[PDB]
């Protein structure tokens, strides 16, 4: 039957049949929300997304957020950088160290298709470690022509904060160079970068570095890892204008997300723990091996690149 009537027509009928909005099904209070429900939480998220809530509700949300006093950490960067993997690794390290004693909230934002009208919110796939009632995730689309953030992003941020969670992580879509839509709304800033980013002078015009709190370079497998790190650290020092320090001590460390148990991941987690403590959020004392360092030594790597092209050698031997 799928070959006879056609998959295209079947999908069209499926799309048109499911067409009805659930706007009338939203609640009218935050009591059950602060209670701890999840389905009503998603209901509120959706209602705020379409802006179907009374301004009184949003005002109460903001009032409670003024008492939330909770960490708001944003991670952004270039498209295809791999920020999602870094977020997954950070969440995994959080769970591993704090014995699943925290209340983690995650918000992702993905671009819309400006032509077709739809979108592909494809970031939850990479993450895998959310199989727990105590860690919640949510995705939102662009839906707007020009920016890369929601038309109600602060509203949903306040709503998520009101839920008495521990820490909120937020990621937008892949950014250009002149965009800073994550700076004023969030508390802490993490920016991802790649070794293949262009000339050294080009590093001086990435405006994101201007407000960046911590910058990490991902996928150190490729060439220029050390050189890229050197240039990044030097540029960060220059933009900071803290001439009193030597280069190696600047708060810039880059990690290799994909390969398991990267040392730089642990170093970055140690730094961020220090940052949160400086901003003062309740947490248990550390329990993992809290090493020092600046760049991962490629530990446990399967092949030291010194023998990458062995097959060519074997062919030459033959």
């Amino acid at each position: 039957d799928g070959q006879r009537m056609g998959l295209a027509g079947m999908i069209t009928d499926m799309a048109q049949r499911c067409d009805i909005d659930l706007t009338r099904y939203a609640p009218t209070t935050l009591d059950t929300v602060v209670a701890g429900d999840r389905r009503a939480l998603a209901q509120l998220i959706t209602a705020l997304e379409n802006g179907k809530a009374d301004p009184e509700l949003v005002s109460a949300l903001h009032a409670q957020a003024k008492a939330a006093a909770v960490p708001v950490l944003g991670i952004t960067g270039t498209g295809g950088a791999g920020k999602s993997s870094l977020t997954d690794e950070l969440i995994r390290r959080f769970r591993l160290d704090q014995d699943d004693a925290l209340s983690i909230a995650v918000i992702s934002i993905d671009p819309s298709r400006r032509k077709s009208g739809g979108a592909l919110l494809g970031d939850r796939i990479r993450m895998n470690a959310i199989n727990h009632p105590n860690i919640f995730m949510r995705s939102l689309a662009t839906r707007e022509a020009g920016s890369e953030i929601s038309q109600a992003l602060p509203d949903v941020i306040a709503a998520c904060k009101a839920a008495r969670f521990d820490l909120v992580i937020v990621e937008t879509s892949g950014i250009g160079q002149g965009d800073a839509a994550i700076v004023p709304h969030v508390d802490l800033s993490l920016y991802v970068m790649t070794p293949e980013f262009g000339a050294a002078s080009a590093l001086e015009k990435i405006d994101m570095l201007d407000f960046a709190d911590f910058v990490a370079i991902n996928k150190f497998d490729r060439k220029g890892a050390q050189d890229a790190w050197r240039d990044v650290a030097k540029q960060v020092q220059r933009n900071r204008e803290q001439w009193h320090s030597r280069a190696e001590d600047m708060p810039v460390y880059g990690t290799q997300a994909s390969r398991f148990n990267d040392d730089g991941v642990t170093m970055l987690y140690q730094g961020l723990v220090g940052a949160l403590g400086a901003r003062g959020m309740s947490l248990k004392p550390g329990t993992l091996p809290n090493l020092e360092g600046r760049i991962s030594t490629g530990q446990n790597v399967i092949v030291p690149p010194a023998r990458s092209r062995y097959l060519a050698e074997l062919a030459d031997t033959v």
Partner: protein
């Protein structure tokens, strides 16, 4: 034409310098070819850093260079 008679030191220095040079060769190869080095300015910046370090140490005076950091004769420095 062969003053090595009686010399441990010549052989020791030779082998150590050889090992250092080969290690630097391995680093250069890991940098991905001389052309890639030229494109990325690796050795240029390395030489810049080493020259800065050398000049800093020379200005410090913790390295004995005869007739510049000391033996400043009280007759001043006319230098026609």
């Amino acid at each position: 034409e062969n003053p090595n008679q009686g010399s441990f030191l010549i052989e020791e220095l030779t082998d150590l310098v050889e090992e250092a040079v080969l290690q630097e060769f391995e680093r250069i190869a890991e940098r991905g070819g001389v052309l890639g080095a030229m494109e990325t300015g690796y050795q240029r910046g390395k030489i810049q850093e080493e020259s800065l370090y050398y000049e800093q140490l020379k200005h410090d005076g913790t390295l004995p260079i005869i007739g510049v950091n000391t033996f400043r004769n009280p007759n001043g420095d006319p230098t026609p």
